[PDB]
Amino acid sequence: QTIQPGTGYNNGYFYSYWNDGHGGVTYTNGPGGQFSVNWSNSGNFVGGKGWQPGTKNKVINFSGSYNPNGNSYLSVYGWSRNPLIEYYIVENFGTYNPSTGATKLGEVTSDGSVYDIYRTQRVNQPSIIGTATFYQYWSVRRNHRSSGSVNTANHFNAWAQQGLTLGTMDYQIVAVEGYFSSGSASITVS
Ligand code: NA
């Protein structure tokens, strides 16, 4: 169903839907691991389905249609605790590349594409445990796609080899994120 911001479980999958207070976003949970989002001149929002908690060896499948009109990501997205980390394995994106706001540490060739690996520090920013300073890890896929499988271990291990430590996993979803843009997306996770 179309729901308001929050977290929970739907048809066997964890979901999280968050936004910054700006309107224009409609997030809808569908059957199984499906969800859809339509946004018209939103602010920042993140919504998707997956698992609570995630694991460090999950092979995540996703498929659907992704039509961003501006700044947006389609990623495997999640958090760890001790250390507190917000991470992304970006499979597709709109007009804004994460490389802008981040620093590059290396590359990994995974699931058919090279990904560039970055770290950034979020200072005094919102998080799963409230306002906090924490690191952000990124793998950004060079060849954008709308379906396939992501072997998360490929990325977590590559990050580790670059000195990026991950804590105990909290949630792990396939999420559509938007940032002051418009767009539409419909995705099934498994
Ligand atoms: Na801040």
In angstroms, what is the span from residue 64 Cα to ligand 1's centroid? 33
Task: Report the distance separating Cα 156 and Cα 132, nearest Å.
Answer: 22
| CA separation, residue 60 to residues 42, 132, 138, 188 (Å) | 28, 28, 17, 11
In whole angstroms, give the CA distance from residue 55 to residue 181. 31
Centre of ligand 1 from the C-alpha of residue 25, in Å = 22
Identify whether the C-beta of residue 19 lies closer than 8 Å to the C-beta of residue 25: yes
**CA 48, CA 28: separation in Å to the nearest integer?**
9
- Range 121-141 burial, b when 16+ CB lie within 10 A, else e: ebeeeeebeeeeebbbbbbbb
Residue 78's nearest CA partner among 140, 165, 152 is 152
Percent helix, strand, coil in the chain, to 5, is: 5, 65, 30
Known catalytic residues? Answer: 86, 177
Q: What is the DSSP string of 36-102?
A: EEEESS--EEEEEEEESS--SS-EEEEEEEEEEESSEEEEEEEEEETTTEEEEEEEEESS--TTTTS
Method: X-ray
Fold classification of 2-190 is: Jelly Rolls (2.60.120)
Residues around the ion ligand 1 (C-beta < 5 A): 124-125
Q: What is the resolution of this structure in A?
A: 1.0
